[PDB]
DNA sequence: ATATATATATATATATATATATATATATATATATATATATATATATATATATATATATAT
DNA sequence: ATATATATATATATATATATATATATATATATATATATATATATATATATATATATATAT
């Protein structure tokens, strides 16, 4: 019932918003508001890459470890297979692993990532963008989704 | 771009010589300094009585006298706490006003730096992605001045919410699993906690 | 966190001795090198 | 007859010397930092001269 | 009685001297970057030699 009421209030909110918009009463980010709003949204993404940094470091370290351990003659074939599976599960359940897994799961629903890149283009088109961000920042944000996928 | 190429280097030569947050990180004693100060301020950021801080700092100083190379005073750690609060005022780490000391912004940046640095688990986390997601959606929808486009936005969003409302009428609710919930919670903490920043 | 209340100084003592970035910020020549390196990488997006 | 074996050149490899750039290490000179001697600011007792009022004389 | 007016007293501020806390100029030691040196590796050229493949003479 809580979720039902939440949905009811949200639909009423959007009902009023639609009634206003159809009446011509739309509202735009006032030209200064948009600038800081964009600067905010940029700052928000500015972490994801700097943490995929650590995702890389972790899995690289895991690989290096598995190699270094495989030298131990004591390890049956069954020992090494288990070590592999457990290393991967552990690296997955750790937070950085959770981030990576979430990203991957998004890739199953590619539509969302593509829509995000589309909306990023539309945003970076708006003139205010030039003010909010020097050339370089706009470049990188324009190509965020890729610079995660590649990574 | 060339617009800032030559200029920027000087912009950095300056910061190194004067900006506090950087200067501290150059000093040899920077580790103990920053650790202790984080300790002090963490308990609360409303502002600390000066001598209450002297006391707590002296308490923390004795804790780390075992760090031999920095010769933390023993005969009177309280006096040393005073002689060191003097330093953190003179060095602009802590402006004090209203009789209660405070952390200059330089300290805020310096501290949020080291925390991100070490290889404990990261600052951001999974939810961040869904966060940029929804905010981008909203930011576009608002920024769009075309009214018919806002109409399309509202129609799609309300149709989505209508799907979920119909499902809720049939009782098909879902919740985060501990994985998701814990992740979102840490994220939200790390998010709102930046409002305090500036 | 209470464990970290002492262990924390250990981490920071570690960084200032080993972690590259921190060590970089310390040496006298640092700002020139850092600025130049950003200049280079700034254009780059594939290396 | 078909096919085999030798000589030739060619294409490649190997070897040597000269030189330069690199790396690893010593010694040096410079900078940060902490340590020191000095002069000065705060707090205190005693004592005196002072203002405020009691205590007090005096008045209507 | 109320109100003016009295000498003494209450309380104070200022002054002298004392001690201790703090700020600073200076000394000194340690930390660090940087120049000098020896040995090493890279690559060049120069030359000899080995290699494959073919031209070629040859057997049966």
Number of helices of chain A: 9
The geometry of chain A reads as: elongated
- Report the strand count of chain A: 0
Structural class of chain A, please?
A: mainly alpha
* Rg from alpha-carbon coordinates of chain A: 23 Å
| Largest interface (CB < 8 Å) | A-B, 49 and 40 residues
- Helix % of chain A is over 70%
Descriptive account of the structure:
This is part of a larger assembly, with 3 copies of chain A. Chain A has helices at 2-22, 31-45, 48-70, 77-93, 95-108, 110-125, 127-132, 135-142, 144-149. Chain A is elongated, with a radius of gyration of 23 Å. Chain A is an all-alpha fold. Chains in contact: A-B, A-C, B-C. Chain B binds a DNA duplex (60 and 60 nucleotides) through helix 5.
Keywords:
Wadjet; JetABCD; 3 chains; 0% strand; 9 helices; SMC complexes; DNA-binding; mainly alpha; 151 residues; DNA loop extrusion; dna binding protein; part of a larger assembly
Topology at a glance:
This is part of a larger assembly, with three copies of chain A.
Chain A lengths: L1 H21 L8 H15 L2 H23 L6 H17 L1 H14 L1 H16 L1 H6 L2 H8 L1 H6 L2
Helix pairs in contact in A: 3-4, 3-5, 4-5
Chain B binds a DNA duplex (60 and 60 nucleotides) through helix 5.
PDB class: dna binding protein
Keywords: SMC complexes, Wadjet, DNA loop extrusion, DNA binding protein
Entry title: E. coli JetABC dimer in the DNA boarding-holding state
